[PDB]
């Protein structure tokens, strides 16, 4: 045994199920109707909302 | 002082591991001691 | 164009004459001589002068820097480059002037780029029996 | 033979779209992880034996 | 499974005052680079500020900017932006930032920004330790001389005295273009510039080897015969040291000229940037122009 | 001269790239397959 006494530090990560409480009408989410955008190609077309 | 004659007029710097190519790394003391030890060894063994 | 100064010799006349006639697929037209009235026009003379000046400068300029980079180089291509310059040397400075010399090399190199890089404008896929007409896709 | 020199590669109704086929010996990739958009280049090199 | 996006939305996460939104509205039709393409990206990935590392080297920023994607800015509104990637070959209207004055038919290049004078206009989007650093769009001659001068500084730094190198830096940091004065920040040495130097030296030596004796002798013959301003001025930069040409071989010479063209291309593309726009229209206020796109 | 040449033809979605075999004359060749390939032919440019 040499003249030092090293200590170890390590991290353990857990996977967890949580519960969450919030008061009614604690925040207001305001939204607008989804906006549609077109992108075109000869093979196929994609639509973004 | 010239016993080696070279085609390439300017030497390159060595690189890569010894498994890729054959190179002659050779300290003077190592070679001289090798020779002086080998010379007597051949004589040992109407 | 470069043969403009040696036109008095029969060798150069024969070389130029053989040069003018360009042969291609069923075509044998001749390109006109850029030297007219025993003289050369300004832009073509400038092109030749810049070409030759770049080629002359590079030989002296590169030798000083190639040895330094080869000292720094580990990929050995600069070492063989210095060996190439050594064989060229066998075959045959103030700092501000050095800077102006590099600047001259590159500034005249700017001029030469026009003749060095052709650009494609059309590539073809349709040829008629009316062959003097064809269809191409366009590029720029 | 019919050849396209622009855009995608599809049959008459575009019901089927054809890929570009390259053998494994002639296919080369330098980057180890691909990005979403990448280009295809043809390379010819000369080994001056 | 997923196609390439053409319209890119951007949303600043931090709150924006009316002044920030006004400054952003002034930036309509500017050129903004992004590192990756998605339909909805954040302002952390937008702009050039992300690549300003502790090195700050101009050459490394030039190299890293080249790999980014080029997008045109449209339709700025409340807290939202619309970025539009220009399709190759079409006509687009653009905005300029640098004090450069454009003209007809210039080939435009994109580069990291320099600064003119006291760095006096940089009060745009100072929000949250982040800056909307736009690139500089300049015509071909300015970019050519930029790359040439950094390359010159790199070559001259070799084995020369530090004080003389500093005098050369003082000279070469300043650039005059169309009666405007520019100054380069951070002309440092970097691995990209070292590789550029290696390639430049190899190309110069190969050019010197390939060039025929006719090409070598032409300068001296013309100088002996003709006397003109360009000839004397170029001879002053050269070194001083009839007869028929001993070798006359058109075939070998034309093959040599083709090879020398190849090597000259190899030397050229080091200083030639990739063309982004070619312009043919200008606003009389010089701020906006319509340009054709490439690259 | 021209120790190497590069020309551009195509842009693809990287997720599309896959491996498959090709059959002709009842024999198999092994190839890589770029599914949704859009071609844009470029010219040859040489690098040394």
Query: This structure's resolution (angstroms)?
Result: 4.0
Q: Do chains D and B have 3 or more beta-carbon pairs under 8 angstroms?
A: no
Residue D24, SS3 per DSSP: coil
Q: C106: distance to nearest CA of chain D, Å?
A: 29
Residue from the list D5, D6, D41 with its beta carbon closest to the beta carbon of F8: D41
Please answer yes or no on whether E202 and C78 come within 8 Å at the CB atom: yes
Identify each DSSP E strand in E96-143 by its residue range: 107-111, 136-139
> Which chain E residues are within 8 Å of D35, Cβ to Cβ?
36
Quickly count: other Cβ atoms within 10 Å of residue E221's Cβ. Answer: 18
> Which chain A residues are within 8 Å of D8, Cβ to Cβ?
41-43
Rounded to whole angstroms, the Cα distance separating E37 from E41 reads 8
Q: Which of E195, D26, E219, E295 is nearest to C77 (CA)?
A: E195
> Which chain D residues are within 8 Å of A43, Cβ to Cβ?
8, 10, 14, 17
Q: How many CB pairs under 8 A join D and E?
A: 7
Share of chain C residues as helix, strand and coil, in percent rounded to the nearest 5: 60, 15, 25
Q: Which of E110, C20, D9, D23 is nearest to F35 (CA)?
A: D9
Q: Running DSSP on this structure, what letter comes out for residue B46?
A: -
Rounded to whole angstroms, the Cα distance separating F35 from F13 reads 8
Cα F2 to the center of its chain, rounded Å: 21
Q: D7: distance to nearest CA of chain A, Å?
A: 8
> Which chain D residues are within 8 Å of E36, Cβ to Cβ?
35-36
b (16+ CB within 10 A) / e for C54-82: bbbbbbebbbebbbbbbeebeeeebbbbb
Residue D40 · residue D20 · CB < 8 Å: yes
Q: Do chains C and E have 3 or more beta-carbon pairs under 8 angstroms?
A: yes
HSE-up of E93 (CA within 13 Å, CB side)? 9
> Which chain B residues are within 8 Å of C82, Cβ to Cβ?
10
Phi and psi, residue F31, nearest 5°: -135, 165
Residue C116 · residue E268 · CB < 8 Å: yes
Decide if A44 touches E, using CB distance below 8 A: yes
Q: C70: distance to nearest CA of chain E, Å?
A: 9
Q: Do chains E and F have 3 or more beta-carbon pairs under 8 angstroms?
A: yes
Residue E108, SS3 per DSSP: strand
Rounded to whole angstroms, the Cα distance separating E112 from E31 reads 12
Quickly count: other Cβ atoms within 10 Å of residue C5's Cβ. Answer: 20
Rounded to whole angstroms, the Cα distance separating C49 from C55 reads 10
Decide if E87 touches F, using CB distance below 8 A: no
Decide if C76 touches E, using CB distance below 8 A: no
| D residues 10-39 lying closer than 8 A (beta carbon) to F | 17, 19-24, 27, 34-39
Structure determined by = cryo-EM
Structure tokens at F18: 């896959």
Residue C138, SS3 per DSSP: strand
Q: Which of C129, C2, A4 is nearest to E222 (CA)?
A: C2
Rounded to whole angstroms, the Cα distance separating E176 from E180 reads 6
Q: D14: distance to nearest CA of chain C, Å?
A: 22
Alpha-carbon distances of E107 from A6, E64, E276, E278, rounded to whole Å:
65, 21, 7, 5
């Amino acid at each position: 045994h040499p003249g030092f006494a090293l200590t170890a530090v390590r991290t353990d990560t857990f996977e967890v199920d949580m519960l969450l409480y919030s008061g009614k009408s604690c925040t207001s989410v305001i939204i607008n109707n989804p906006i549609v955008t077109k992108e075109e190609r000869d093979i196929s077309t994609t639509y973004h909302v | 002082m010239s016993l080696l004659h070279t085609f390439w007029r300017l030497p390159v710097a060595v690189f890569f591991e010894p498994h890729e190519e054959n190179v002659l790394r050779c300290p003077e003391r190592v070679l001289r001691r090798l020779l002086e030890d080998a010379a007597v060894t051949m004589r040992g063994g109407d | 164009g470069l043969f403009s100064l040696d036109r008095s010799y029969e060798e150069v006349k024969a070389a130029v004459q053989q040069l003018q006639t360009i042969t291609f697929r069923d075509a044998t037209f001749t390109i006109p001589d850029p030297v007219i009235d025993q003289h050369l026009l300004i832009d073509m003379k400038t092109a030749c002068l810049s070409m030759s000046m770049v080629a002359n400068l590079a030989s002296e300029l590169t030798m000083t820097y190639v040895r330094k980079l080869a000292l720094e180089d580990s990929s050995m291509l600069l070492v063989k480059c210095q060996e190439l310059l050594m064989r060229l040397d066998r075959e045959r400075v103030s700092p501000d002037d050095e800077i102006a010399r590099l600047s001259a090399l590159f500034v005249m190199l700017r001029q030469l780029d026009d003749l060095i890089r052709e650009q494609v404008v059309f590539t073809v896929c349709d040829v008629s029996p009316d062959n003097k007409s064809a269809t191409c896709i366009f590029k720029g | 033979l019919t050849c396209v020199m622009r855009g995608y590669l599809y049959n008459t109704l575009k019901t089927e779209v054809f890929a570009l086929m390259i053998p494994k010996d002639m296919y080369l990739t330098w980057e180890e992880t691909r990005g979403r958009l990448q280009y295809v280049y043809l390379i010819i090199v000369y080994d001056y034996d | 499974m997923a196609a390439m996006e053409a319209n890119i939305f951007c949303t600043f996460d931090h709150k924006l005052s009316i002044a920030d939104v006004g400054k952003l509205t002034k930036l309509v039709a500017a050129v903004v680079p992004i590192p990756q393409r998605l339909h909805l990206i954040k302002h952390y990935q937008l702009g050039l500020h992300q690549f300003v590392d502790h090195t700050r080297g101009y050459v490394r920023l030039r190299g890293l900017l080249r790999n980014m994607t080029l997008t045109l800015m449209r339709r700025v509104e409340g807290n939202q932006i619309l970025l539009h990637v220009p399709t190759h070959g079409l006509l687009y209207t653009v905005l300029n930032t640098g004090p450069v004055t454009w003209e007809k038919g210039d080939a435009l290049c994109v580069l990291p920004p320099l600064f003119h004078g006291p760095l006096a206009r940089e009060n745009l989007l100072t929000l949250g330790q982040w800056e909307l650093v736009l690139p500089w769009i300049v015509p071909m001659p300015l970019a050519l001389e930029i790359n040439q001068r950094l390359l010159i500084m790199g070559l001259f730094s070799l084995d020369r005295s530090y004080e003389e190198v500093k005098a050369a830096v003082q000279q070469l940091q300043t650039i005059t273009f169309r009666d405007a004065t520019f100054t380069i920040p951070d002309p440092v040495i970097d691995q990209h510039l070292l590789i550029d130097m290696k390639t430049a030296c190899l190309s110069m030596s190969m050019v010197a080897n390939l060039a025929s004796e006719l090409t070598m002798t032409y300068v001296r013959k013309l100088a002996l015969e003709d006397s003109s301003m360009l000839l004397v001025k170029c001879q002053e930069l050269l070194m001083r040291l009839p007869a028929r040409p001993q070798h006359v071989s058109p075939d070998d010479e034309i093959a040599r000229l083709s090879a020398l063209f190849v090597m000259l291309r190899q030397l050229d593309d080091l200083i030639r940037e990739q063309v982004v726009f070619t312009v043919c229209d200008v606003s009389p206020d010089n701020k906006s122009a319509t340009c054709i796109f490439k690259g | 001269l021209c120790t190497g040449v590069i020309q551009k033809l195509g842009w693809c979605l990287a997720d599309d790239i896959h491996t498959s075999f090709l059959v002709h004359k009842e024999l198999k060749l092994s190839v890589v397959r770029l599914d949704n390939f859009s071609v844009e032919l470029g010219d040859f440019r040489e690098f040394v």
